[PDB]
Amino acid sequence: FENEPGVIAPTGFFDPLGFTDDIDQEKFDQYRTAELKHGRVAQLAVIGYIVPEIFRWGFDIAPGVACADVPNGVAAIDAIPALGWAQIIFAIGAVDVRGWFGNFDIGKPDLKGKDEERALQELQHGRLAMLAILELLRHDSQNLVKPGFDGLDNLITGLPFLY
Amino acid sequence: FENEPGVIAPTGFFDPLGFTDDIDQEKFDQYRTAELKHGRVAQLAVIGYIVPEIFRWGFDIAPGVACADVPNGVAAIDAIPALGWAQIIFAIGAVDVRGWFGNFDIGKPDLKGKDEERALQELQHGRLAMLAILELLRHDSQNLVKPGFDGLDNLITGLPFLY
Amino acid sequence: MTTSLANFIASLTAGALVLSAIGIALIIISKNDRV
Amino acid sequence: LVGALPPVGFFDPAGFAAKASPEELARYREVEIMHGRFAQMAVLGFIIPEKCAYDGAFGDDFLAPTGRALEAINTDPVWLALTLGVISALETLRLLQTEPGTRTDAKIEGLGWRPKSEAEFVNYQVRELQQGRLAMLAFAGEIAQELVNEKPLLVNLQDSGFVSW
Amino acid sequence: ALRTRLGEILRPLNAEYGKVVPGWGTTPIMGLTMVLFLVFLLIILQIYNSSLIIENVDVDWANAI
Numbered sequence: 152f153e154n155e156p157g158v159i160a161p162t163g164f165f166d167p168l169g170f171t172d173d174i175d176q177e178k179f180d181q182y183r184t185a186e187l188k189h190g191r192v193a194q195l196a197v198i199g200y201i202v203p204e205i206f207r208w209g210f211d212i213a214p215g216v217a218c219a220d221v222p223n224g225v226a227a228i229d230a231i232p233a234l235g236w237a238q239i240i241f242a243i244g245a246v247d248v249r250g251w252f253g254n255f256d257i258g259k260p261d262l263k264g265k266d267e268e269r270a271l272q273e274l275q276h277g278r279l280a281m282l283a284i285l286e287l288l289r290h291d292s293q294n295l296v297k298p299g300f301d302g303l304d305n306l307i308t309g310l311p312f313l314y
Numbered sequence: 315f316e317n318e319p320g321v322i323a324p325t326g327f328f329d330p331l332g333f334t335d336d337i338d339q340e341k342f343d344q345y346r347t348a349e350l351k352h353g354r355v356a357q358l359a360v361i362g363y364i365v366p367e368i369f370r371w372g373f374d375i376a377p378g379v380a381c382a383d384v385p386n387g388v389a390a391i392d393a394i395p396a397l398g399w400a401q402i403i404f405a406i407g408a409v410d411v412r413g414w415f416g417n418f419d420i421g422k423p424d425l426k427g428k429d430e431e432r433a434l435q436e437l438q439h440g441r442l443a444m445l446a447i448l449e450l451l452r453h454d455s456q457n458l459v460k461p462g463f464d465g466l467d468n469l470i471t472g473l474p475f476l477y
Numbered sequence: 478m479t480t481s482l483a484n485f486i487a488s489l490t491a492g493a494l495v496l497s498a499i500g501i502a503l504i505i506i507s508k509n510d511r512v
Numbered sequence: 513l514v515g516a517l518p519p520v521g522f523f524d525p526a527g528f529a530a531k532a533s534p535e536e537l538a539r540y541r542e543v544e545i546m547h548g549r550f551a552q553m554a555v556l557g558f559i560i561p562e563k564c565a566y567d568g569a570f571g572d573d574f575l576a577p578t579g580r581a582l583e584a585i586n587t588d589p590v591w592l593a594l595t596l597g598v599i600s601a602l603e604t605l606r607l608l609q610t611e612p613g614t615r616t617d618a619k620i621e622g623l624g625w626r627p628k629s630e631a632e633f634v635n636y637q638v639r640e641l642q643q644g645r646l647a648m649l650a651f652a653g654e655i656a657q658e659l660v661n662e663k664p665l666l667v668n669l670q671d672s673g674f675v676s677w
Numbered sequence: 678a679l680r681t682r683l684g685e686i687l688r689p690l691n692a693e694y695g696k697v698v699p700g701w702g703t704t705p706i707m708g709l710t711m712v713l714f715l716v717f718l719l720i721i722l723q724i725y726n727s728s729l730i731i732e733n734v735d736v737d738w739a740n741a742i
């Protein structure tokens with residue numbers, strides 16, 4: 152291959168382990184769509200981690216009010232009942248696979264000028280979001296399993312001006 | 315169409331609402347797959363409802379041990395932690411979409427003789443299995459929301475020699 | 478990690494050294510007088 | 513030859529590459545590769561046992577008071593000498609089995625990975641050279657710091673801030 | 678030679694008499710595995726012989742539970 156969007160400049164074609172050697176064009180499409188979906192999820196999840204520390208919603212997710220719920224991160228999954236999580240998961244999945252909502256003709260915008268460059272920028276931002284989500288999950292799990300394993304506080308560290 | 319497996323004898327071609335009128339073959343295949351999957355799920359689910367009322371394993375599933383603790387009814391969703399349910403759903407979906415395990419060379423030999431008259435039997439058993447849940451579920455939900463709606467006990471009614 | 482473990486691993490190292498010395502002698506002498 | 517990584521490009525303030533036969537250049541490359549490999553191994557072998565002693569995994573009295581990796585010299589001399597002798601015998605085998613100009617090439621060729629593309633091979637050579645270059649300085653830094661301060665690396669870090677735990 | 682159903686089922690498992698891989702091959706793995714096995718056997722033998730003492734291991738009749 153070696154001729155596809157994704158090469159930036161400092162590294163060029165980044166295939167050190169030879170993953171894309173004995174494959175045809177159909178498998179690289181699956182690789183690319185998986186990369187894009189993981190990156191978009193990470194891009195959403197960085198903000199989804201940052202924002203719930205300044206304000207909350209006015210809901211109640213059943214008996215336990217959604218505002219001032221469990222502590223933001225990994226501890227928040229246990230508070231929500233499993234049936235609601237299954238509901239949200241299946242709604243997400245229906246929207247994803249079936250295409251209900253999301254795919255709106257008003258969505259696909261302009262696309263008049265640069266197209267091969269904006270996608271590359273989106274991919275780079277997504278990769279950075281992937282790495283940020285790792286650390287974030289690493290910090291959350293490490294501090295939740297044992298309090299004070301690393302001598303740091305303020306969950307979203309690095310940004311002390313928030314919490 | 316009007317020429318496909320599914321017709322048995324007592325009624326014949328059951329399409330009163332005429333869903334398949336301006337329909338091609340691909341949507342018929344999709345509908346056939348949907349019916350087969352829903353029916354197989356119901357066939358497994360009726361057994362899954364009936365079995366745990368008498369014997370069960372000693373699984374841990376986190377600190378919430380399943381040894382005669384989690385109820386057999388639809389209330390079992392909230393007893394198990396949500397993350398375990400998510401992992402189970404993801405594994406089942408991987409099997410569902412990517413065919414992991416499942417299809418195997420020892421998968422289904424036989425099939426040398428009776429071929430058309432086995433799929434029809436599977437379909438009929440699945441249809442009656444789907445009618446089962448509706449009542450088993452309806453029964454469980456009605457008896458769970460507030461007991462006393464129906465003058466009975468012992469979830470599965472009609473099998474007094476179980477519980 | 479007691480003294481017994483340290484001495485055991487040291488004995489393993491010494492045995493490896495002896496075997497290596499023997500093998501080196503055999504290889505060198507065999508390559509010299511090829512035939 | 514294959515160095516000059518974009519960070520700083522070619523680097524030779526002393527100009528040793530001017531007055532040098534091609535055989536001398538090949539010898540210099542071989543010496544660099546060997547020193548780099550040994551430096552990487554030594555850095556790892558200082559990092560790991562010190563952490564094992566810090567966690568207390570290897571019982572008490574592992575590397576004496578001030579449990580640095582250099583205490584093995586004065587707590588186990590015979591064993592250190594035996595290790596050095598084994599290494600010397602193995603490298604004597606390497607010397608007597610290899611001709612000049614190929615001293616860095618072990619004829620494995622069937623047990624590793626060795627990526628197919630030649631450009632990827634050159635990139636892997638550069639990566640080996642770079643990690644070896646880093647380890648060569650790291651080893652000397654570790655030796656100097658331990659000899660000056662007489663304290664372990666992680667202990668020094670926890671003593672002088674830097675780290676939080 | 679009589680042919681049976683079980684014979685036809687198991688026929689593929691006995692069909693490659695004499696097939697080999699040309700010239701050495703996985704022999705170094707075999708040698709390394711044998712050396713590791715020898716080290717393991719020596720360790721357990723010396724533990725049982727009380728010539729190798731390690732913490733929290735007591736070679737004597739145990740109260741068990």
Ligand code: CLA
Binds near residue numbers: 188189240404405
């Ligand atoms: C019922 C809901 C549902 C359904 C039907 C689908 C269906 C699909 N998704 Mg999907 N997805 C969903 C919810 C759903 N998604 C949610 C909620 C997220 C965000 C968390 C994603 C994120 C996502 C990504 C990033 C990708 C898909 C992809 C796909 C497609 C193929 C992969 C597949 O079937 O899974 C197969 C499942 C696996 C192989 C399992 C992988 C192992 C993981 C890591 C286990 C993680 C378990 C973890 C502990 C629990 C997570 C809880 C919490 C973090 C959410 C398929 C159309 C892929 C696609 O279209 O391209 C190929 C793809 O790249 N999805």
Ligand code: CLA
Binds near residue numbers: 238244347351403
């Ligand atoms: C990662 C998870 C995953 C993925 C990717 C798939 C992938 C697929 N499934 Mg599938 N499935 C899964 C898990 C998964 N399955 C599990 C765990 C179950 C059993 C609970 C099923 C049961 C199932 C059936 C019965 C059918 C499929 C079908 C399909 C195919 C198209 C539909 C689709 O992608 O979702 C599309 C998703 C939707 C349209 C969502 C529908 C809305 C749901 C029904 C609302 C439910 C709300 C309720 C409150 C949640 C209950 C949770 C809990 C109590 C069970 C595709 C191959 C269908 C198929 O092959 O033919 C079309 C089909 O008929 N699956």
Ligand code: CLA
Binds near residue numbers: 514645646
């Ligand atoms: C003894 C170790 C050693 C050796 C033999 C070499 C050898 C080489 N290096 Mg090199 N290098 C080393 C260590 C070494 N390097 C270290 C530690 C770094 C920093 C991490 C670098 C960074 C470096 C760069 C960036 C480049 C080279 C390049 C080269 C090649 C051309 C340079 C030349 O003309 O001769 C080199 C000189 C000699 C062979 C003679 C030995 C030098 C004197 C006699 C030793 C004095 C050391 C002195 C006491 C400093 C002490 C440091 C202190 C911390 C203790 C050559 C093969 C260039 C190249 O080929 O790329 C195209 C190049 O671009 N090197």
Ligand code: CLA
Binds near residue numbers: 486500
């Ligand atoms: C080149 C770098 C280097 C050097 C010089 C040393 C040196 C030493 N290490 Mg160390 N180490 C290193 C890298 C290095 N290490 C790395 C990379 C790690 C990370 C895994 C470690 C982890 C480590 C630990 C955890 C420990 C040591 C220890 C030691 C000391 C005793 C070790 C010993 O006797 O092993 C014996 C020597 C070997 C196992 C080498 C292999 C011998 C081969 C297999 C023999 C070949 C077979 C034979 C020749 C066949 C003969 C046939 C014939 C024909 C040839 C010694 C000072 C111990 C100590 O107390 O000191 C701190 C200790 O507990 N090291």
Ligand SMILES: CC1=C(C#C/C(C)=C/C=C/C(C)=C/C=C/C=C(C)/C=C/C=C(C)/C=C/[C@@]23O[C@]2(C)C[C@@H](O)CC3(C)C)C(C)(C)C[C@H](O)C1
Binds near residue numbers: 258287
């Ligand atoms: C982990 C860590 C940290 C961190 C971090 C990092 C790096 C986090 C990651 C940050 C990063 C890299 C965040 C990128 C965001 C990109 C965005 C928001 C763009 C969205 C743009 C969107 C949603 C576009 C929307 C469009 O609708 C438009 C406008 C037109 C439409 O027609 C079409 C579409 C849909 C395209 C701390 C907390 C900082 C410190 C700590 O110490 C360590």
